[PDB]
Amino acid sequence: SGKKEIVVAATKTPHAEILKEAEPLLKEKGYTLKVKVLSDYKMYNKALADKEVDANYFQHIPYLEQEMKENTDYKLVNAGAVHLEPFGIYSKTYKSLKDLPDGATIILTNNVAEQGRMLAMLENAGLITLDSKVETVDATLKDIKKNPKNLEFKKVAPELTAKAYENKEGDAVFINVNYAIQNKLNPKKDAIEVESTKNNPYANIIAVRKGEEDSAKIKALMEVLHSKKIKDFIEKKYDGAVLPVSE
Numbered sequence: 607s608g609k610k611e612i613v614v615a616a617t618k619t620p621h622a623e624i625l626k627e628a629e630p631l632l633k634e635k636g637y638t639l640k641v642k643v644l645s646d647y648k649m650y651n652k653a654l655a656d657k658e659v660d661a662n663y664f665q666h667i668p669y670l671e672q673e674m675k676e677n678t679d680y681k682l683v684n685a686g687a688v689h690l691e692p693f694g695i696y697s698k699t700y701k702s703l704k705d706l707p708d709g710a711t712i713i714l715t716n717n718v719a720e721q722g723r724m725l726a727m728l729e730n731a732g733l734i735t736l737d738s739k740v741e742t743v744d745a746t747l748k749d750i751k752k753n754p755k756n757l758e759f760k761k762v763a764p765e766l767t768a769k770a771y772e773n774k775e776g777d778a779v780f781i782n783v784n785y786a787i788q789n790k791l792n793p794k795k796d797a798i799e800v801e802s803t804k805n806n807p808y809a810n811i812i813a814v815r816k817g818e819e820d821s822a823k824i825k826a827l828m829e830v831l832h833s834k835k836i837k838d839f840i841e842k843k844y845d846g847a848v849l850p851v852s853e
């Protein structure tokens with residue numbers, strides 16, 4: 607019974623909503639589901655490593671890799687990809703990145719793993735150039751080669767960038783789709799720039815403890831999260847802000 611229950615820590619939206627949609631499909635396979643939502647991204651891998659949950663559903667592989675680099679006690683594994691959230695830039699004050707003035711302030715999130723993801727959007731917009739000798743996924747602010755608009759950067763918790771946006775604390779603000787939707791923003795209608803879906807390594811995953819990735823429970827969960835019902839749910843409910851991907 608408890609051996610048939612899957613406890614998962616997930617961010618509120620879309621991840622806990624996708625799990626709630628998957629619940630009756632898991633019962634059809636013989637498994638129950640318990641979902642825990644936590645207050646910030648740093649809590650989810652800790653809960654898993656502490657054995658309070660069986661799995662978490664909140665991050666991408668670069669985030670997971672960074673977390674394990676920082677905490678050698680985390681012996682975690684990717685059980686499989688589910689969905690992609692193309693990253694957004696938001697502004698109350700400018701309509702596009704081409705319109706930002708010299709000295710403009712860019713509010714980055716403080717997510718170490720996503721520093722290259724953010725900067726790559728600015729490089730693709732033609733605002734900065736990054737050192738070509740560094741992989742984009744590994745790029746930081748130290749890797750900026752050219753900055754002809756002399757952009758200045760600030761860092762806010764990913765949980766609070768929706769507030770930096772509403773407060774007009776900078777000229778342009780990065781918000782992860784999960785926290786954008788959690789704040790009642792619609793990323794495809796409200797963002798001023800959206801990340802390309804091409805060549806994108808930031809699919810969100812199910813993570814488990816090492817040695818648990820082929821367990822019956824986790825295979826059952828991966829199965830439901832790749833069903834036609836769950837892919838169609840994702841596609842309809844989030845209006846293209848969230849996209850199902852292969853495992």
Ligand code: MET
Pocket residue numbers: 647664665666669690691693782783784808809810
């Ligand atoms: C904790 S890594 C960020 C995850 C977030 N759901 C995104 O894909 O942008």
